[PDB]
Amino acid sequence: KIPGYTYGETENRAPFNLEDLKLLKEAVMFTAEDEEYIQKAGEVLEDQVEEILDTWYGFVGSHPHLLYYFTSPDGTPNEKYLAAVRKRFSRWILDTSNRSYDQAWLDYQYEIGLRHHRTKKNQTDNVESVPNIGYRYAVAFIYPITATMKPFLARKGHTPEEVEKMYQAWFKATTLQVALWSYPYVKYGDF
Amino acid sequence: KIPGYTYGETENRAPFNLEDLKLLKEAVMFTAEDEEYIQKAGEVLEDQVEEILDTWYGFVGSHPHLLYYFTSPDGTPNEKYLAAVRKRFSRWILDTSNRSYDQAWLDYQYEIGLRHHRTKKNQTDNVESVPNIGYRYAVAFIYPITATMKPFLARKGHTPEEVEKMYQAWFKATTLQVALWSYPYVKYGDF
Ligand code: HEM
Ligand code: HEM
Ligand SMILES: [C-]#N
Ligand SMILES: [C-]#N
């Protein structure tokens, strides 16, 4: 088992529903074509995850105000926390590529939002760290997620045109998720 | 000369400052290289704005749940509201590329967020319309903004390298802005 990974068995049903998801997919221009290309992206990325993780957490570690969110009270990174979260992030790369975006998927999107937010941050791994990840950075991180995945999507010999379809699908899917994760951050009724 | 366009003359100072901005630029991987290329993007886009606007508002207009946010209470689109906003969106394309990202800029970023939010929506143009734009869609729209801009960035004969750099700069800058606009939506203390 991956500790903390509770896909399909969360405590709560998401407050947003499949019709909400349909309308949000429309807003990010995500279609069945992107379902196909995000699956292809998974096939490309899967055996590269260790490098992807080093690249991603190397970016987070590169700026003290970002690494901050994994820190103990003494301002140093909590290595237990980083390591446990890293295994769930690795799984999220696969889930984004391989799951159907169905009710179980939506329920886990609510869960991941809750875990970045003060509602559930630091509970999954039972760590002492900062209480909330400022929403400004959740939105910001759509960009570095896509810039991180880009070079890996080209490393299996796909043409620029195919890489572009995978990259755009990943961009749409990442934006879609962060949009959903806003729920616990946003004043009730404003989401 | 643009009705409702009050850049430099907002009633409020922004609740985020230049240090917040520096740290958020770092979160979207924005550097002096992007300053060069966002300015080049403006030079490329400036004389294409009518077609860009037709494309963008064509996208909004093609989805009833998005066009919704410009409708009168009787459910029908308010074309005056659309037209007035269109003029300020046109200017935003130039501002994104030409303004220093400084205090005045931050003040107007807070203003734009307030205008999508119930705080100020429908006041600028003195219209009667939907009270609030749900934040889920503001995040989602990062994607179709970038997808709208992309083809136009190639239309002045720049090299593929330069077009990609302009596109990435636009994506960083759009993400940066939507992150800032979240302020009035986000539970107090969670931004
Ligand atoms: C596009 C935005 C982001 C994506 C795609 C992303 C992805 C993920 C994933 C997949 C997980 C594990 C979820 C699970 O428990 O199964 C996670 C957890 C976490 N992320 Fe992010 N994340 C984003 C934004 C942020 C930001 C802005 C930070 C700031 C450094 C950050 C820091 C963390 C931390 C500290 C956790 C553990 C939260 C907890 O205590 O449960 N993430 N993230
Ligand atoms: C990336 C996200 C978005 C961008 C870049 C964007 C851009 C803009 C700009 C530049 C303006 C005029 C600002 C001014 O007053 O100077 C504006 C206003 C407006 N936008 Fe957006 N927008 C975004 C999201 C949305 C969404 C999700 C909707 C839903 C259709 C929308 C609908 C409108 C409406 C109705 C107004 C007028 C608000 C008011 O009454 O003042 N926008 N937008
Ligand atoms: C989040 N990593
Ligand atoms: C907003 N358009």
UniProtKB/TrEMBL annotation, chains A, B:
Highest taxon in the source lineage: Archaea
Binding site residues for heme b: Y81, R88, F89, Y108, R115, H116, N122
Segment forming the signal sequence: none
Keyword Phosphoprotein included in the entry's annotation: no
Keywords: Heme, Iron, Metal-binding
GO molecular function: heme binding; metal ion binding; oxygen binding
Entries under InterPro entries matching the protein: Globin-like_sf, Globin-sensor_dom, Globin/Proto, Protoglobin
Domain Globin-sensor intervals: 19-188
Protein name from the UniProt record: Globin-sensor domain-containing protein
